[PDB]
Ligand binder design. Sequence first.
Ligand code: HEM
Ligand code: HEM
Ligand code: XFK
Ligand code: XFK
Ligand code: H4B
Ligand code: H4B
Ligand code: ZN
Lengths: 404, 403
Amino acid sequence: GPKFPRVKNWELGSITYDTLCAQSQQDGPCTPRRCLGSLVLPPAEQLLSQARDFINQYYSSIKRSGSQAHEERLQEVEAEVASTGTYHLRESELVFGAKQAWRNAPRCVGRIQWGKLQVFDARDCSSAQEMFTYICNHIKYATNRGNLRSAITVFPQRAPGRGDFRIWNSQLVRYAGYRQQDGSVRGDPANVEITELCIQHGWTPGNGRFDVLPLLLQAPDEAPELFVLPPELVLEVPLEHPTLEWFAALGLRWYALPAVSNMLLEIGGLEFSAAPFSGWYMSTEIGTRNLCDPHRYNILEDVAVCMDLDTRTTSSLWKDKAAVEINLAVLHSFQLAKVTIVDHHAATVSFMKHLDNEQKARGGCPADWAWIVPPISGSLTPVFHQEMVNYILSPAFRYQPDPW
Amino acid sequence: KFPRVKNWELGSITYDTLCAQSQQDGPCTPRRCLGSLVLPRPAEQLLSQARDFINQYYSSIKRSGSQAHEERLQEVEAEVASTGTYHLRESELVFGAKQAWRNAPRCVGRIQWGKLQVFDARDCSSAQEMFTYICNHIKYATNRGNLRSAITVFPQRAPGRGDFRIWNSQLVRYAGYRQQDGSVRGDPANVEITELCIQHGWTPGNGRFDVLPLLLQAPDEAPELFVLPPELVLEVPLEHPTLEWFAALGLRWYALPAVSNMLLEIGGLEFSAAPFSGWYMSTEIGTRNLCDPHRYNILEDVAVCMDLDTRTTSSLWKDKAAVEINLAVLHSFQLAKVTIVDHHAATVSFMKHLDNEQKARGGCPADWAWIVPPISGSLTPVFHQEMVNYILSPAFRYQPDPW
Ligand code: HEM
Ligand code: HEM
Ligand SMILES: Cc1cc(N)nc(CCc2cncc(CCc3cc(C)nc(N)c3)c2)c1
Ligand SMILES: Cc1cc(N)nc(CCc2cncc(CCc3cc(C)nc(N)c3)c2)c1
Ligand SMILES: C[C@H](O)[C@H](O)[C@H]1CNc2nc(N)[nH]c(=O)c2N1
Ligand SMILES: C[C@H](O)[C@H](O)[C@H]1CNc2nc(N)[nH]c(=O)c2N1
Ligand SMILES: [Zn+2]
């Protein structure tokens, strides 16, 4: 009947219809001819319509839709655009947009927490040194000695004919990856390029597998400046296994704070090129992807050898067994150290609760199935059996190309 | 126009040009992706699908634009112009069947696509005859545990009349008996088909692993019930390589995965009954069939036997039991000398298939959500591989349940 996508859960037999997708003003990469769902990378008039839409979202969310203050704010926005080509958000408009951008993020499984975000307003920042102060404050607040708190710091928006604020690092905490004489990599192969950029800009590098990178921070029309994070600020967790005693001997570790720093936060047509945001980890991020991806730390074989598994044949499931233990090491070590973490079962249960909340509140929830389903034990989690509709809503976080 | 397709593990890139051959729209639009949805929500027409297919066939035998190609195009035209339909030659049917498998985006086993035994059952005129054909197929495919891909093709759909149909979703399925207490003994996925069998006269067993009888339907007739001779249905008792108590769970599975409810479309003609079989990938049994909450749902039972801490999600007791259940499937099939493939071997060979199809055809339609296995996703190479999904013809299609 209903003229909207029907959405089914195949575990429970239950059906909903996504009406929220009607609100989408931006096209994805799919067409009736072909689905491109699995691809990782997909003027005054334009801005004004995006701005009007954002302001309407803001006044709806406070239930003052159509009211005098709403119409006056609309008028204020177009007058400002009419005379400068841009406009500026009020403090509470920014807080709302930031939460909404997180709420709208299709690839994030942690969205049950969306209303609980500390928005640090840093739109007064005017130097790379001050970005560093702001960032250090973010890290201290967010880390909270292991009791992690979601946060985002917002630096000044893109301006006509003026350079961007950029953090060059993809996260505020990353391990160095050192290209070796034998072609191999010591540390994190993901970070080879950023490591080499740091050295070029005068960083004296280490030679470990877990050297915390410095930050490369760029203020408008300036070369980026290098800043070392004081080690007492970067909380890390040494990895041990609850029953396999040798696991600690591997000297594996990971940091507490997952903090994305290279994404663009778009709100009502305004673009915040530097707006680092953080939460807490889902255990599979560390245990499965970071430690077991072949193009990352690639430790599966080492761990299976320690576990004395038959690594010569696929059908011993040595890969699956070792990956489980590594993931269990991640959970146990964070729990022991009292650093917030969530396992993939609890995270996905909570995402299902979030889907239900959003069905009631907005009549849908944009979600990217391939990213929501965890990289181990997929169908053991409830999200695997849940159909999802993926579409772009604004405010949004958006990928941006590296500035170098 | 042509999408770039990247492997994120290796950094390699291709471009899919094959997708331009799609003539059938899927469920997505620029406004929203519906790629995760399980189901989709005239003379000149048939003639053009028929032409294109015949063109595909003569192309495949490198006789494109020859005399035989010309005269065959004319036969099809002449037949459609007079009767509103036409008929395939056996070799064309064989080609079209292999192509529908090749073109199937949810299938991880497509490296095998050229190795398919095709039984022509288009001279079938009764449920009885359907049954004999089905028994031949099973015996052939099973081959004492050395499984061989096969398909049997029953008579095409005709505008005048009802369809030949196999009511069962697979040739071999375990019954699900709805109990007094609303629980299900056996397989919850097969409650409805079990009740239909009983209603049409089947005396039911009471076990967890009772092989269902077949309900076969010839055009515009009530379906008929046929019991498969137990000697034809190969089964594998499940035991564990080290965990001695597992064998006592009394668990088992059938050797032969044989889809019997899909429609095969070739050159515009529709084959409403066309059962096909290969061999299992171990996650289908070990993860989905035994571990789904709405299936046999044995996870907790296994975890408790393993004496795991089931009180909390963070002990990863589900992940651990799931791995052992999969191991037990692999080991038991190996022990019983019945063909099986694990999810690492299958996805590695699927990657090879992708490369083969890239050179052969300029692409390969693939549904990522179905190609990536249900456990240990990112541990297989397919996780890190971008995929383009689209509908090519010949094709297997979903069709409504006949009741
Ligand atoms: C509160 C705890 C959180 C958890 C457990 C969580 C979980 C996750 C996970 C597992 C992913 C996929 C990441 C990957 O596989 O690389 C993700 C993606 C994402 N999340 Fe969260 N998240 C949390 C908080 C946040 C916050 C605070 C924000 C921003 C305000 C956010 C926004 C995003 C965005 C934009 C993506 C997509 C990133 C990309 O495409 O690179 N999440 N989340
Ligand atoms: C040779 C061994 C084969 C293996 C290991 C294999 C593997 C698989 C797997 C794991 C699936 C997904 C099943 C699920 O999750 O329900 C699948 C789907 C499928 N396969 Fe295969 N396959 C094989 C042979 C075949 C053959 C012989 C055909 C037809 C001639 C075929 C056509 C299909 C089709 C049409 C689907 C999608 C069915 C649906 O949407 O329900 N495959 N395959
Ligand atoms: C706030 C937050 C919390 C959390 N638990 N995880 C994250 C994920 C961070 C993360 C880690 N590794 C990789 C990525 C993906 C980076 C990335 C790369 C490309 C090519 N396209 C994208 N859209 C995104 C993101 C963020
Ligand atoms: C030939 C073959 C070989 C193999 N190894 N596995 C299979 C899996 C068959 C199979 C088993 N259970 C369930 C399904 C899916 C059934 C199915 C159900 C619905 C609602 N829509 C669809 N498109 C498909 C398929 C087939
Ligand atoms: C090719 C595929 O789109 C890609 O590997 C995706 C799949 N799903 C993912 N899901 C999450 N959460 N994170 C990822 O990096 C990926 N990678
Ligand atoms: C909703 C979701 O698309 C659905 O659960 C799919 C996911 N991937 C799958 N993949 C395979 N191979 N088989 C399946 O049944 C499913 N189920
Ligand atoms: Zn799509």
